[PDB]
């Protein structure tokens, strides 16, 4: 169900005689038998888990911590990564750029892994067959196949019904619409093909 | 850098050598290895082992600027060489 490979890593418990195993999404280039250093004094190497405050601007990171201690929540899909845009030592904050293009401010102590998530380029090969979609979603959840609303009857969908298959009403619905009505382009700021940059 | 290639070629053409980790170890043990050359992708454990042997035998180790494919090409072979021992410089100045 995940497009990015996982890395099983073994650490030594500092307080008892035992081994602790960690399961994290692997950064590309990580290999079995490699050593990963996690902490505030770890160096800048692929796979190391370090606070974002220690990184230079332009560094690419993954598994970014939205809040200090949440154990890595951002840029976890295959091939994705965030970038360190800027620092502010006075407030002890770091500005980063998320995969979606948004810019977010985090505490400089938030940890992240250096590198980008492995398995990139997955969504370039077409899923030529419908069976491939079937197998893809049989490992994730029940969200396939997708029946168009216009193909339904008016009892089950706002778009259903009619002697011709048509919506009949604007497909852009307000944000505060009711549960059974909020279908289509929700709170759409604009529609149509994007001509330019957005 | 570019000099070691020429010196190695001269050794291969005139000197005496052994290609490979096992013969390198044996030659170090029996003390007929004038020099040991190690490719840069040699396993870290094997590298440490060969350097320990060279320290015991008072022999020089040269870290070739290339992996075993290029080291074999430099040796003039069509296979990969990760370690080699020059036992007689022949008509070359590789040892010095």
């Amino acid at each position: 169900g995940r497009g990015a490979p996982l890395a099983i890593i073994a650490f030594r418990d500092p307080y008892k005689y035992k081994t602790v195993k960690t399961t994290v999404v692997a950064a590309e280039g990580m290999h079995t038998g490699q050593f990963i250093h996690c902490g505030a004094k770890a160096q800048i190497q692929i796979g190391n888990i370090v606070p974002v405050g220690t990184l230079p601007e332009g560094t690419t990171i993954c598994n970014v911590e939205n809040k200090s201690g949440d154990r890595g929540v951002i840029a976890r899909a295959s091939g994705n990564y965030a970038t360190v845009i800027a620092h502010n030592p006075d407030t002890k904050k770091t500005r980063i750029r998320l995969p979606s293009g948004a810019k977010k401010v985090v505490q400089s102590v938030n940890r992240a892994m250096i590198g980008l998530v492995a398995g990139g380029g997955r969504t370039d090969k077409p899923l030529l067959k419908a069976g491939r979609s079937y197998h893809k979603y049989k490992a994730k959840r029940n969200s396939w196949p997708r029946v168009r609303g216009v193909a339904m009857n008016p009892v089950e969908h706002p778009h259903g019904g009619g002697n011709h298959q048509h919506i009949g009403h604007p497909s852009t619905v307000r944000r505060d619409a009711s549960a059974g009505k909020k279908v289509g382009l929700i709170a759409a700021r604009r529609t149509g093909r994007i001509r330019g940059g957005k | 850098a570019e000099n070691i290639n020429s010196r190695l070629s001269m050794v291969m053409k005139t000197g005496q050598y052994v290609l490979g980790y096992k013969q390198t170890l044996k030659s170090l043990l029996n003390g007929k290895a004038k020099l040991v050359i190690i490719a840069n992708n040699t396993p870290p454990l094997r590298k440490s082992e060969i350097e320990y042997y060279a320290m015991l035998a008072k022999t020089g180790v040269h870290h070739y600027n290339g992996n075993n494919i290029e080291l074999g090409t430099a040796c003039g072979r069509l296979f990969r060489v990760c370690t080699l021992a020059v036992t007689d410089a022949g008509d070359s100045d590789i040892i010095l």
């Binding site: 590309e28 295959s78 492995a118 | -």
Partner: protein, 88 residues
């Protein structure tokens, strides 16, 4: 003899799915079914196990790589940047 003039590996799909889609699938199918030179042992023995996992038949090293290529261009540039920063 050359069995197929241009379809190559995607000849398994017959006449289905469209010429352009089969052409797009061909590059990545060839890449994912190719064998790559391992950076640890130096032999052409790296094969894809699953999307993003590449195993070496000789040294038995498993690497996290691309979905259909052993290494990605973005990962290469990131590695170059880290190495450059380390040097300077």
């Amino acid at each position: 003899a050359k069995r197929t003039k241009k379809v190559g590996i995607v000849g398994k799909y017959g006449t289905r799915y469209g010429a352009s889609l089969r052409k797009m699938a061909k590059k990545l199918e060839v890449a994912q079914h190719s064998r790559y030179t391992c950076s640890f042992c130096g032999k052409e023995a790296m094969k894809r196990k699953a999307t993003g996992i590449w195993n070496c038949a000789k040294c038995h090293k498993v690497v996290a790589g691309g979905a259909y290529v052993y290494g990605t261009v973005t990962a290469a540039t990131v590695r170059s940047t880290i190495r450059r920063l380390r040097d300077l």
